[PDB]
């Protein structure tokens, strides 16, 4: 179930029917690889199989050494976080004396364990690879004596397979300064992640959401290289917690709304700037202005609250009544009437202005509509492509009904002579305020110019009195003939 | 044959001689990997070679299962597209009943085939890897029975080589939620891509352009994981169509133009905001404000029309006459007189203000020019580096002639007292509009205060009549006889 509404009056469109999945918190897991402590590789061997092992064994030593050296529109309104602050803090605790020993003792007879850190944090732990056991129990006989009791290739192959993962984890970390995202399948296989999720301290609905979307979980995760000490390699994997699920979501698409006068320099424009994703959340609305920070999987939308504003639920009113008295809808103003299109969920908004050729075509029919100047819309039903100027847009073909809501474009409600066209970070009320002020100064100045153009200049400066008659000064004496007798 | 012109009057420079390559459309191909349907691998074998086969076989099964879960300055003026709408649409059709069978049947006797889908779109299909044939003819005869016919170690290795592509394709998709870009050589080898291009419904010029620049094609392509069904793995590869080639292109560089008065903060500045790539296209001009979205290979420039505005060709006039009456050139204003440089195609623009040390140096001579305050330019001929403040810039060393176009910096034409300096999203006319309004209220209000003093004030309000004499009000009775 997906529907869409286009508002002709404000050159915008809302796509709804979406369901939320918001990362609200972080869970930190500790992934460990048990290492072998292999100094010198005592051998006089010049046998091919042992030779392969020394180049491969060297890759193992180099990786350890290498890892050791390693550890020695309205988006501008968003706050600024520290994405791996929680993971780093847990990693910091692992560096405290005695701390690694707690973890190491815990994981001897099981690969999965919960460990409480010295600061009280209880973390899930995972031994994902035991290289200590493998080298010390298999290849140790050829490597710990000068005298070298040789090795065979099916064992060699097995060693290359097991060691390779260590090399890739090191590789990833080496070019990411110890912090990677998304978390790759070398860092954490699909099964490993799934069992991690299952053993996580979260509700069942959350477990289901994450398991059916593990690929999204990976992209919102971090792998943090943490410590190598006492033959234990440990990196912190920081996983998303989705504390908001299945609330309604909608996407607001907006496009410039301009007047359509013939003269190219006489037009004025208006654009809703509050486009982005909106989700109901805990009695308020979480607003994600940069919709590219969200990933959509069918009708489920994954976002990160780190990229949201928290708005009053009255923000929805800009959709139904942009002049509503309860929320000050944000807009920008300009005179830049260039043509473009916004491809929506179920159609396309077309802002076609000036002399631009703007059309919509069907697969088999070809061009079926030529847009006139103004802001308009077409549904994805029977339309396959849209062209605006030299730009071709393919429309989204998902099923769903669209509703075209007719109304006079509000840009027509403004008198261009007092319209503030250089407002970038503006809103309805702010624009209204300036228009009232411009109108105020025209009431007053016209009253002033009227009253002044009404006033008479000085009368002559001679020993004679003057009275006013027929628009000029006349001598008083003129009118006194007859007072005698 | 790259040339450059610097316009001193507006602190900007145009680089020309470039040839266009604009992605105008999308072609969707369907890439398939034929899969083997292998449930249990029954064997108590504890032979090393067979043991390797069981671990590798598990990687194959795991890859399949994993893939299955998967499928269940002026840039702000640009529109908003759906980049893979065409690819996704083709993928949606592939989920329809019978659809996989058409493809599977088509590629029965060839690895390359054209298939018309149920909605009428004719797409090229490519079986790039046949793991079904390899496992059923190599591996299946030995795993047939519990008692397992041990394969030479060399056969095992071969399986790792063939399976590896599948593991890598799966790996890429797993960390990209089924959509990757650029398209890797695991998704599509060079020979595969080249043959795709050759079999594509495009002109020979396009085939030539794409084959000679496959690395750009990869960066402009998408791989979309689509379906695993009935032993067929299929992903859609969405390839760029270049419908505009070899039209003239030019790149506009701009930098702040400020006054150079002594008093700090008393200066006003102006910057052309319409910088970016420009290409002649179908009687209009395609403008790419975010020039970082375009990639240049020698004198060829690759752009995406998804990132352009379509402008009247009169937009070029801003280069010859920024005050022209036919196009309203876009600018920003400020009082932020900070120093910087913009490295152009054939030189460097230097905006040097305040107390900043700004120089240009040669390799062997060292500093050869010290810039005075203002906006200036130097060509890359005989100049190797530029320093503005603490920032060193290496200049581009391509061959080409530069032209320095002299003219008074236009910021000098403005009265700082009525200059709107806090306009970010502005233009020439808008600034004029505001200057005119500030000037109107100063002409008129000062015109009005003058000549107010010329009018006569009110006469006394005491129920007595007054007449005017010698600049004062005098009682009417004065001039009578009491009568």
């Amino acid at each position: 179930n997906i529907t869409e509404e286009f508002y002709q009056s404000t050159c915008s469109a809302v796509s709804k029917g979406y369901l939320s999945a918001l990362r609200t918190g972080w869970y930190t897991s500790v992934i460990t690889i048990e290492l072998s402590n292999i100094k010198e590789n005592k051998c006089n061997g010049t046998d091919a199989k042992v030779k392969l092992i020394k180049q491969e064994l060297d890759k193992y030593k180099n990786a350890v050494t290498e890892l050791q050296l390693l550890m020695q529109f309205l988006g501008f309104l968003l706050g600024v976080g520290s994405a791996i602050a929680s993971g780093v803090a847990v990693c910091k605790v692992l560096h405290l004396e005695g701390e690694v020993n707690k973890i190491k003792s815990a994981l001897l007879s099981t690969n999965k364990a919960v460990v409480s850190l010295s600061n009280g944090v209880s973390v899930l732990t995972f031994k994902v690879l035991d290289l200590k056991n493998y080298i010390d129990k298999q290849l140790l006989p050829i490597l710990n004596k000068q005298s070298c009791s040789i090795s065979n290739i099916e064992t060699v192959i097995e060693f290359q397979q097991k060691n390779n993962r260590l090399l890739e984890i090191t590789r990833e970390f080496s070019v990411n300064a110890g912090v990677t995202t998304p978390v790759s399948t070398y860092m954490l296989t699909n099964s490993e992640l799934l069992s991690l999720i299952n053993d996580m301290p979260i509700t069942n609905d959350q477990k289901k959401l994450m398991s059916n979307n593990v690929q999204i979980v990976r992209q919102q995760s971090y792998s943090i290289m943490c410590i190598i000490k006492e033959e234990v390699l440990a990196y912190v994997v920081q996983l998303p917690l989705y504390g908001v699920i299945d609330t309604p979501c909608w996407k607001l698409h907006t496009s410039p709304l301009c007047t359509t006068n013939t003269k190219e320099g006489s037009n004025i424009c208006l654009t809703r700037t509050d486009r982005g994703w909106y989700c109901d959340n805990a009695g308020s609305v979480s607003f994600f202005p940069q919709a590219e920070t969200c990933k959509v999987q069918s009708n489920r939308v994954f976002c990160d609250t780190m990229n949201s504003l928290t708005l009053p639920s009255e923000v929805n009113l800009c959709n139904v009544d942009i002049f509503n008295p309860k929320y000050d809808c944000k807009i920008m103003t300009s005179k830049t009437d260039v043509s473009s299109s916004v491809i929506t969920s179920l159609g396309a908004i077309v802002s076609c202005y000036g002399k631009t050729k703007c059309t919509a075509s069907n697969k088999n029919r070809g061009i079926i509509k030529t847009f006139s100047n103004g802001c308009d819309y077409v549904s994805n039903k029977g339309v396959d492509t849209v062209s605006v100027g030299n730009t071709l847009y393919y429309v989204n073909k998902q099923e769903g009904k669209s509703l075209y809501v007719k109304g006079e474009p509000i840009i027509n409600f403004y008198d261009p002579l007092v319209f503030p066209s250089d407002e970038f970070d503006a809103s309805i009320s702010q624009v209204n305020e300036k228009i009232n002020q411009s109108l105020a100064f025209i009431r007053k100045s016209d009253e002033l110019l009227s009253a002044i153009g009404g006033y008479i200049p000085e009368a002559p400066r001679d020993g004679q009195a003057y009275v006013r008659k027929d628009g000029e000064w006349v001598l008083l004496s003129t009118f006194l003939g007859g007072l005698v007798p | 044959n790259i040339t450059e012109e610097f316009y001193q009057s507006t602190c900007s420079a145009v680089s020309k001689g470039y040839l266009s390559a604009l992605r105008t459309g999308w072609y969707t191909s369907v890439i398939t990997i034929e899969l083997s349907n292998i449930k249990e691998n029954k064997c108590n074998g504890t032979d090393a070679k067979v043991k390797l086969i069981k671990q590798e076989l598990d990687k194959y099964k795991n890859a399949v299962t994993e893939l299955q879960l998967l499928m269940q300055f002026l840039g702000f003026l640009l529109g908003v597209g759906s980049a893979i709408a065409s690819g996704v649409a083709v993928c949606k059709v592939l989920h329809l009943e019978g659809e996989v069978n058409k493809i599977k049947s088509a590629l029965l006797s060839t690895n390359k085939a054209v298939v018309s889908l149920s909605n009428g779109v004719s797409v090229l299909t490519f079986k790039v890897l046949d793991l079904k044939n390899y496992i059923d003819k190599q591996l299946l005869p030995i795993l047939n029975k519990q008692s397992c016919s041990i394969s030479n170690i060399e056969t095992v290795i071969e399986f790792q080589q063939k399976n590896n592509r599948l593991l890598e394709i799966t790996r890429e998709f797993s960390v990209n939620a089924g959509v990757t870009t650029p398209v890797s050589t695991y998704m599509l080898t060079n020979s595969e891509l080249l043959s795709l291009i050759n079999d594509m419904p495009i002109t020979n010029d396009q085939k030539k352009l794409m084959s000679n620049n496959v690395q750009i094609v990869r960066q402009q392509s998408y791989s979309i994981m689509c379906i695993i069904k009935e032993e067929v793995l299929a992903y859609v590869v969405q390839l760029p169509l270049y419908g505009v080639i070899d039209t003239p292109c030019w790149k506009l560089h701009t930098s702040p133009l400020c006054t150079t008065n002594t008093k700090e903060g008393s200066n006003i500045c102006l910057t052309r905001t319409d910088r970016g790539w420009y290409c002649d296209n179908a009687g209009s001009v395609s403008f790419f404000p975010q020039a970082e979205t375009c990639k240049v290979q020698s004198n060829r420039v690759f752009c995406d029309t998804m990132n352009s505005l379509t402008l009247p060709s009169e937009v070029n006039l801003c280069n010859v006459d920024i005050f022209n009456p036919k196009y309203d050139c876009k600018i920003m204003t400020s009082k932020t007189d900070v120093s910087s440089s913009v490295i152009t195609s054939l030189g460097a623009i230097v905006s040097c203000y305040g107390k900043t040390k700004c120089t240009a140096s040669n390799k062997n001579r060292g500093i050869i020019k010290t810039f005075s305050n203002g906006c200036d330019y130097v060509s890359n001929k005989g100049v190797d580096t530029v320093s503005v403040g603490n920032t060193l810039y290496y200049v581009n060393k391509q061959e080409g002639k530069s032209l320095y176009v002299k003219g008074e910096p236009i910021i000098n034409f403005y009265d700082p007292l009525v200059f709107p300096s806090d306009e970010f999203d502005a233009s020439i006319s808008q600034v004029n509009e505001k200057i005119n309004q500030s000037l109107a209220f100063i002409r008129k209000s000062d015109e009005l205060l003058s000549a107010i003093g010329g009018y006569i004030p009110e006469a006394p309000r005491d129920g007595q009549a007054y007449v005017r004499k010698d600049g004062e009000w005098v009682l009417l009775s004065t001039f009578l006889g009491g009568l």
């Epitope: 059309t359 075509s361 697969k363 088999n364 070809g366 061009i367 396959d384 492509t385 062209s387 100027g389 030299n390 730009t391 071709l392 | 604009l22 105008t24 459309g25 999308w26 072609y27 009428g120 779109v121 004719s122 594509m200 419904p201 495009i202 002109t203 020979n204 010029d205 396009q206 169509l241 270049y242 419908g243 505009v244 080639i245 070899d246 039209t247 296209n281 179908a282 009687g283 395609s286 029309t305």
Partner: nanobody, 125 residues
Framework: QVQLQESGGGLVQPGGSLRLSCAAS????????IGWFRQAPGKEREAVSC????????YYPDSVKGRFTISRDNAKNTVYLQMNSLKPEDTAVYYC??????????????????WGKGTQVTVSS
């Protein structure tokens, strides 16, 4: 404004040759791609030949490559499709079509913006 007018259709014997003409009016070729398409009875419409208005570069599907050639006469503003060694399977209605190069999306019937009304070609006896 924009019109396309195909002509030159008629009865041809197998192995015979025929030339079709497509007169463009209302737009400029330089900015466009011109294509010849055909639809045989009961079958979906398929591309036959595309040409670039600017460069003159051409595209022929595998099925007719060698037998069919497309050309343009700048002086007459007309695009021609020469058909040689015609086969009965070439019996179809032949359509002229075009698309702006800005919107170019391949020589495919679903990738065209304007269509002529067609001209019938029949290879028979």
């Amino acid at each position: 404004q924009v019109q396309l007018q195909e002509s030159g259709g008629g009865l041809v014997q197998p192995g015979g040759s025929l030339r079709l003409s497509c007169a463009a009016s209302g737009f400029t070729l330089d900015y466009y791609y011109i294509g010849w398409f055909r639809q045989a009875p009961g079958k979906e419409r398929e591309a036959v030949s595309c040409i670039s208005g600017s460069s003159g570069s051409t595209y022929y599907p595998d099925s007719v490559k060698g037998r069919f050639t497309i050309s343009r006469d700048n002086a007459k503003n007309t695009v021609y499709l020469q058909m040689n060694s015609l086969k009965p399977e070439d019996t179809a209605v032949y359509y002229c079509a075009t698309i702006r190069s800005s919107s170019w999306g391949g020589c495919v019937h679903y990738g065209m913006d304007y269509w002529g009304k067609g001209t019938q070609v029949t290879v028979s006896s």
